[PDB]
């Protein structure tokens, strides 16, 4: 049903990747010359620090300029609320789409639907226009939206469009400012696909760990100061996997790119994205 205080759909995780893109392309809106994927959910709180106050603001303007889609979690809590925030202000000030994919079972309130309206267990940001709720298992605590997101990204990457000036397939860029939890797994899975080229922001997180890196012993010293509570509470069975995953990312450093907090020069985001592509 539609959402208004705006469309939300509920689909199975096993659902085919193509059908999603076909529906979006055929009548809702025109073909996308660009796409951006943002990692989020590692920390519910998002700190509006001076560094983050500029990069995403420039990125959203770039997306509007290129007509790029933005793929975020879609919840009011976190970075996606500000990605939504800024998107709405751009419209207030040619059209920018914002797709948010979350877990259907992870949603506290679900209303069947003309269009059912709910006004304020995860809450959903109003700014994002389209919301996709994956339901592989009902009331399933574990998050499954990441798998469907990865499948959709893989399909879109293989999609071929003659438009624009990018050979064959349309461009894809993954922005990695959030750290740890689903962020590292998402980066690993995306890098597994050749087409995606990840980008790491300058914030203080495990993304900062990856930025600093560019065996297990070499990287063990890293992330200790950045995430003390995370490592201390994390069991050894989880810490070992966390440090194992970093090797896969560092194996292929050519695809990834680093945005350094230092450069005060404007449009750093554009330079980073263009270089990565």
């Amino acid at each position: 049903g539609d959402i208004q205080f705006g469309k939300y759909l509920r689909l199975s995780c096993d659902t085919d990747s193509e059908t999603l893109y076909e529906l979006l392309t055929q009548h809702w809106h025109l073909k996308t010359p660009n796409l951006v994927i943002s990692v989020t959910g590692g920390a519910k709180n998002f700190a509006l620090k001076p560094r983050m106050r500029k990069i995403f603001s420039r990125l959203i303007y770039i997306a509007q300029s290129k007509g790029a889609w933005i793929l975020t979690g879609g919840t009011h809590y976190g970075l996606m609320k500000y990605i939504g925030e800024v998107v709405r202000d751009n419209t207030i000030s040619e059209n920018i789409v914002a797709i948010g994919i979350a877990a259907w079972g992870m949603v506290s309130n679900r209303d069947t639907l003309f269009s059912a309206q709910y006004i304020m267990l995860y809450i959903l940001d109003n700014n994002h226009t389209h919301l996709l709720l994956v339901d592989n298992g009902c009331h399933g605590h574990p998050t499954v939206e990441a798998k469907l997101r990865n499948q959709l990204e893989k399909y879109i990457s293989e999609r071929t469009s003659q438009d624009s000036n990018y050979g064959g397939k349309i461009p894809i860029v993954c922005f990695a400012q959030g750290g740890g939890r689903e962020t590292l797994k998402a980066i690993n899975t995306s890098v597994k696909s050749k087409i995606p080229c990840v980008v790491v922001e300058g914030s203080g997180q495990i993304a900062d760990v990856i930025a600093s890196l560019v065996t297990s012993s070499m990287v063990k010293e890293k992330l200790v100061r950045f995430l003390p509570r995370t490592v201390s509470r994390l069991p050894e069975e989880e810490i070992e996997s966390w440090i194992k995953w970093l090797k896969e990312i560092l194996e292929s450093s050519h695809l990834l790119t680093v945005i350094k907090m230092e450069e005060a020069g404007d449009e750093i985001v554009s330079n980073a994205i263009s270089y990565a592509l």
């Binding site: 759909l9 509920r10 689909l11 199975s12 659902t15 059908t19 999603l20 529906l23 009548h27």
Partner: peptide, 11 residues
């Protein structure tokens, strides 16, 4: 129409 299409997406 659109209503028929939407039903297919969920399956």
């Amino acid at each position: 129409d659109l209503v028929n299409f939407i039903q297919a997406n969920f399956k």
